[PDB]
Amino acid sequence: SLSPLAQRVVTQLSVMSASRKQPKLLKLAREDLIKHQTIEKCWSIYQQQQRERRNLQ
Amino acid sequence: RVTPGSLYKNWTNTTHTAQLQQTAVPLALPIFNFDDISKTLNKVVSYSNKQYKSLHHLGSFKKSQFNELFQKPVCLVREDATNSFLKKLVSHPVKKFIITGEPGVGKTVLLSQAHAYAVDSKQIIINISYPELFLNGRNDFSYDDDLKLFIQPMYLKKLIRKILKANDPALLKSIELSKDYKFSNANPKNASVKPFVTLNKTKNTVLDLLSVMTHPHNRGKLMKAIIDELSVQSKVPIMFTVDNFSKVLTTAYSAYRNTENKQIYSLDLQMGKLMMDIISGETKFANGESSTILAISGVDRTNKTLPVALGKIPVDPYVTRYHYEPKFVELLQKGNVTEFEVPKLNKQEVNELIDYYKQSNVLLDKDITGKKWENLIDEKYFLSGNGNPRELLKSLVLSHR
Amino acid sequence: SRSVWKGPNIVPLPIREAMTKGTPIRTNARAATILPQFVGLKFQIHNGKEYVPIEISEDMVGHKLGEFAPTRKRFSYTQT
Amino acid sequence: TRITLPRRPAKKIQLGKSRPAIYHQFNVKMELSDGSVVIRRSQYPKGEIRLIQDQRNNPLWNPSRGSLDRFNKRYSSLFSTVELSEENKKKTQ
Amino acid sequence: VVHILGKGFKGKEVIKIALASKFYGIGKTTAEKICSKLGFYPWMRMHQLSEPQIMSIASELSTMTIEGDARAIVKDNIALKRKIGSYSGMRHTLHLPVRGQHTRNNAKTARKLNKIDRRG
Amino acid sequence: KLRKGHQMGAKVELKGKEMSQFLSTLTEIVLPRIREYKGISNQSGNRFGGISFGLTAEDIKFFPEIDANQDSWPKTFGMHININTSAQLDYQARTLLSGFQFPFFGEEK
RNA sequence: AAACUCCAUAUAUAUAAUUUUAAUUAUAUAUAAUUUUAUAUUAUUUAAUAUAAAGAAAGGAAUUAAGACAAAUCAUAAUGAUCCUUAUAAUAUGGGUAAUAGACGUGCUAUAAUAAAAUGAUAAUAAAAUUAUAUAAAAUAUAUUUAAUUAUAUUUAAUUAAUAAUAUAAAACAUUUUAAUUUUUAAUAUAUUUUUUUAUUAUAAAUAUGAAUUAUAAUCUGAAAUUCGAUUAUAUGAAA
RNA sequence: AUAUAUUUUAGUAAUAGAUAAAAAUAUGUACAGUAAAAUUGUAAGGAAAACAAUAAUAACUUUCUC
Ligand SMILES: Nc1nc2c(ncn2[C@@H]2O[C@H](COP(=O)(O)OP(=O)(O)O)[C@@H](O)[C@H]2O)c(=O)[nH]1
Ligand SMILES: [Mg+2]
Ligand SMILES: [Mg+2]
Ligand SMILES: [Mg+2]
Ligand SMILES: [Mg+2]
Ligand SMILES: [Mg+2]
Ligand SMILES: [Mg+2]
Ligand SMILES: [Mg+2]
Ligand SMILES: [Mg+2]
Ligand SMILES: [Mg+2]
Ligand SMILES: [Mg+2]
Ligand SMILES: [Mg+2]
Ligand SMILES: [Mg+2]
Ligand SMILES: [Mg+2]
């Protein structure tokens, strides 16, 4: 069917592939989703501020 | 491409292991007994059934002999050789012998006779035929922690089994134990329910102790206990014997290697050390009549050690460890070993042997038919080198020249 | 001298002048062991016929000079 | 002639359902030539590595701060400059 | 049957001898030393080895220099020889005998396997 | 001996933090373990803010994922490394790369 | 040609204070055989076969004529003729004679069990020959935890020799082992084959043949071992 | 730590993006995008394999900020 070299190539391919290695989707509650949004937005704002500070300097 | 019936082995092995003793004449010969040696002093004698049973178990009858020639292994009694040795054994205070002689003279036969005598006179026999097995490295071994020496728990098991079977159980179970003994259990039955076997002091027996079956690492402990028990008991005599003791003497270091790659010393093993202790005045048996009978083999190497141990040569200090080990000599001197030289056959003895062979129908036609009997005997004596029994036998049967 | 004791095989050369000023050393020795004291010196080692230019290797330190000047021509067969 | 792995029918990733390849990675500490440790994410399972030949001991990366070796080892008792002066007559060339 | 470090082994094959036969880095002495370290009786057979015992030989084998790296050192040595305009390196490149031999006749083994990539 | 439409090697565009890490690894681990490497050439590059160089199969065995196990990788392949900057011209890009500990050896244009 | 000759043989004599001993020897001088005799059986007084009695009585070496082959040699050496004479004569340093497609002889080692390997210190059994341009003993050290073996180093005891050394001859013979071979091993029992037997379980075309080829480390000789020498060790283990 | 039973995993295989000029379904429909050449480079790579880069931001919307 397959050689040892062929097997090892398949194994190598598998290492890179998403076949049966990836978890379930990250589902959130609506409150949790909001909390996440507020975390991300604030962070983004902070990053923008920092960029402006550096740019201004 | 081999069947069960066909002979696949080499010659010596074949002669030992393929039963060609089957096709042989039944011979109503007299029976070997020390109490009635006066009757059968210079005659061929078959062993008793019990003796045979014991002797086979021990490992007295060996491969390179011509025991295939007859129905069962047979010897003759000899006034100069065997009878004299027996008398010495009976009489001496030390009772501690090494059977020396030239190759093929009949040392193993002498040992077999001594064993047979011991069997007759209600004695236990611990025979170590071929120490090469424990000395050369061809079975498992392990460094025990309690006993500061290397145990060998394949050989040991076999030796224990031989001891059990060679000796009768009535004599062996007359001995009560001195101490209590815990051992690891190793039965197929009750492995969950019985991981530990216990032998009590008065209730249990030496037979029971022998029948114990442990894991390899407790086998050496078991052996040690058994030896101690036998030393303690004064009810029955213990005949210890070691044939091919020449190998032991010469092979000072075994083929086994410890953790670091170097050869293990014979006295650092369990078996060889034990044997040495038995030889010397150290593990002293409580009973009288309890002997050690060692035997040299012409097969094995020769060197200065054994002569130096005996009253033969002065001690040269400069000769090498390989050709002279002084520790072994010292040990031999400690336990007063009086050597016994096996003498070569007389003319009359040779004649008697030849007559026996003729009766059994081993002689060739050119020997028997058209030849004077006395002349034939004289020729046989000449060709043996004046009565080397093996050589004589070879000339008789294995010549065809 | 091959054997480690009594080694190496030393020969007199115009070494110091070569070290001062890049003047190649025309050796007809071929059995002088290369040393650490001349790595990066230009040698012109004899080949029987013609002297061979070599800048002594940093790895050549153990070897002889004649080992890097191959005396015989590379064999071929005229397929006639 | 051409050595290959022959393809099976491809699995249909639906539009929107495609997920990004987040490979399994460990936080790995690299101690360089000197004792400066640096954390890097790595796919091979080894929490700690210490390096021998790095930029922090290479002369090119810090200018301000084995036949020869074998020879030195096995001609060490002699100690082989003075030796150069002894064995350098510049007459013959 | 009894696998150890990838190399297959028939039963009844004496361990040290078997190791010497199979593994590239080791001969007679090395195999004996390994056996001593692990504590197998000499002339013990490959079938007798328990699972813990097998692993320690593999653990021992792994600790010892073996196979591709050992081959690489020798291939590396020949690569080094080649790099420096050396006679030996030249012989290796051209598939002739290296050790000061005659080649007017009988130089067939050298031709067969005096490569830069030596071993296989 | 090359056909059309045959899978032959691979590429990967790194951007942001992974790219930065890869550069840091190149500077510290890999490019010092190359024995005789002077630098990236000063004649290398685009006309506008892009510099490049390549690693042999010998050089890839110094990467710690490769480096940790020689045994898993019997074969190993060289690679080209195209660095793309936000530089107007190439000398500016070279200067930037030097700031991140990349040595530059050749005679500049 | 044969014979005389030499070696070897048998016998005798001589010599050797039987510590230069091996008298079971060595070496001078003899004698001895190209053996003799008789009874018969075939072919014609003899000649072959057989038998018998008398004897130690049976080989090898050197010697290879005349002629021939215009056989080989001017590279052992010499000489004729001829050619070279700052070169075809003379000295040094390196290289070559050891190059490698195919081919051809001679050998060596192999392709394993009527055959290979370990071991064998009251050291199983020889002969012939060499040692002042030397032979190198015992013993110590390292390779190597014992020691022996083998190889080097250390240092020269003895003898320039029937006196000492090279040198404990080796096969032999004996025990052990041996893949191919589930023709074996090891766990249990088993027993009047016990260095072994039986039962039931598990043991699944180049090796534990061969030694080419190569890598590294040492050693030896020599002033020098790269082309281009010889050992030892650890790996490598083609072909067959 | 280990034994049995009952399960669960390991068949290890590529696209992860509405993919966009390597090759492959050549007719429908829906959605989206832009090619090529030449030039400058880069490990083997060379005139010729692959990858990168190569026209202009005025005004507009949102975000941060002086
Ligand atoms: N004393 C004796 N020996 C015998 C008799 N029958 C045979 N033998 C021989 O005795 C020999 C045993 O001798 P042994 O000393 O064991 O030989 P070694 O093993 O070489 O020492 C055997 O080879 C037998 O052939 C007998 O009736 N009496
Ligand atoms: Mg015997
Ligand atoms: Mg090997
Ligand atoms: Mg003549
Ligand atoms: Mg004498
Ligand atoms: Mg003539
Ligand atoms: Mg002629
Ligand atoms: Mg001629
Ligand atoms: Mg002339
Ligand atoms: Mg001339
Ligand atoms: Mg010359
Ligand atoms: Mg020649
Ligand atoms: Mg000839
Ligand atoms: Mg053979």
Ligand SMILES: [Mg+2]
């Ligand atoms: Mg000596």
Ligand SMILES: [Mg+2]
């Ligand atoms: Mg002498």
Ligand SMILES: [Mg+2]
């Ligand atoms: Mg001998």
Ligand SMILES: [Mg+2]
């Ligand atoms: Mg083959």
Ligand SMILES: [Mg+2]
């Ligand atoms: Mg071999």
